[PDB]
Write a protein that binds this ligand. Structure first.
Ligand SMILES: CNC(=O)[C@@H](NC(=O)[C@H](CC(C)C)[C@H](O)C(=O)NO)C(C)(C)C
Ligand SMILES: [Mg+2]
Ligand SMILES: [Mg+2]
Ligand code: NA
Ligand code: NA
Ligand code: NA
Ligand code: NI
Ligand code: NI
Ligand code: NI
Ligand code: NI
Ligand code: NI
Ligand code: NI
Ligand code: NI
Ligand SMILES: [Zn+2]
Length: 284
């Protein structure tokens, strides 16, 4: 039995200004990647992330107050989105979850290293099914997937409860090398399973009506190395030096956040990046 996560994607003025006309494709590209992660067999469930609504905030007053404070930005957001949801799931534009993208550097109660935030186990509560995501380039697709984990009640993989069952998975509290063959830990698989078995995802049973089409291409087909560097380091950045770490310009100064090149990214004629390796596009 199939879960469809009817989603609204929302992007603030910083996003509108940075991305201009390409913003909606960018959001859908981010979400296509997350949607793929949620189809991986390791999650032990059938889960379909679909978009039913996008809102861009060209006008700051028509959005929530976005600030550097992650949990307030999230509280501002989760309240504001309520007004934008029809009350029956019968309405084609009714969403089970809302996600805010900002270029604003989000900060926790210690550092601004924070890349996103969500509340835990909220997926079918319209007043709390929310997450906020820092757009630091195409890595935001993983941030999205991670925060939607929490919304599905998965805790961090280093939490006491995950000891029996289990930093190489989606719900690692810090980024490391993701185990591309099994992105979801045994703890994540069990915790989302329990949540749904306990009947907490009843709003995820109904199919989307006229959902917004997700890009079927890999993200590096849309966005070359220079473009990815621009997403992370601003429009004046471009690619420096392959596939494992993207270095970007900033004398020749280059810099990195230690992220991989997006899957699909060209690394020479007839080759492109997959799981941080430059492989042939035609597979033998
Ligand atoms: C390179 N930086 C990181 O890994 C940061 N981690 C995060 O930002 C987490 C999200 C990642 C997508 C794992 C976030 O704190 C979270 O748990 N959201 O629910 C650090 C640990 C430096 C704060
Ligand atoms: Mg509305
Ligand atoms: Mg030089
Ligand atoms: Na941040
Ligand atoms: Na930061
Ligand atoms: Na987990
Ligand atoms: Ni303000
Ligand atoms: Ni493991
Ligand atoms: Ni410009
Ligand atoms: Ni310029
Ligand atoms: Ni290059
Ligand atoms: Ni560094
Ligand atoms: Ni990797
Ligand atoms: Zn987390």
């Amino acid at each position: 039995s199939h879960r469809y996560v009817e989603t609204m994607l929302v992007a603030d003025q910083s996003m509108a200004e940075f991305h201009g006309s390409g913003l909606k494709h960018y959001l859908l590209t981010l979400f296509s990647v997350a949607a793929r992660l949620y189809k991986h067999p390791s999650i032990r469930n059938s889960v379909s992330l679909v978009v039913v609504k996008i809102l861009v905030i060209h006008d700051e007053q028509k959005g929530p107050e976005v600030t550097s404070n992650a949990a307030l930005t999230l509280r501002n957001f989760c309240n504001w989105q309520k007004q934008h949801n029809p009350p029956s799931d019968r309405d084609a534009e009714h969403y089970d979850t809302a996600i805010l993208f900002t270029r604003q550097d989000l900060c926790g109660s210690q550092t601004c290293d924070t890349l996103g935030m969500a509340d835990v186990g909220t997926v079918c509560d319209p007043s709390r099914s929310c997450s906020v995501i820092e757009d630091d380039g195409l890595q935001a697709a993983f941030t999205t997937a991670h925060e939607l984990g929490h919304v599905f009640n998965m805790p961090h993989d280093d939490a006491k409860q995950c000891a029996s069952l289990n930093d190489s998975h989606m719900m690692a509290s810090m980024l490391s090398n993701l185990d591309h063959s099994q992105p979801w830990s045994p703890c994540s698989a069990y915790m989302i399973t329990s949540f749904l078995d306990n009947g907490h995802g009843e709003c995820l049973m109904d199919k989307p009506q006229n959902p917004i089409q997700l890009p079927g291409d890999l993200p590096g087909t849309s966005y070359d190395a220079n473009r990815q560097c621009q997403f992370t380091f601003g429009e004046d950045s471009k690619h420096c030096p392959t596939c494992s770490t993207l270095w970007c310009t900033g004398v020749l100064v280059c810099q990195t956040k230690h992220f991989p090149w997006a899957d699909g990214t060209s690394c020479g004629e007839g080759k492109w990046c997959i799981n941080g390796k430059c492989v042939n596009k035609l597979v033998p």
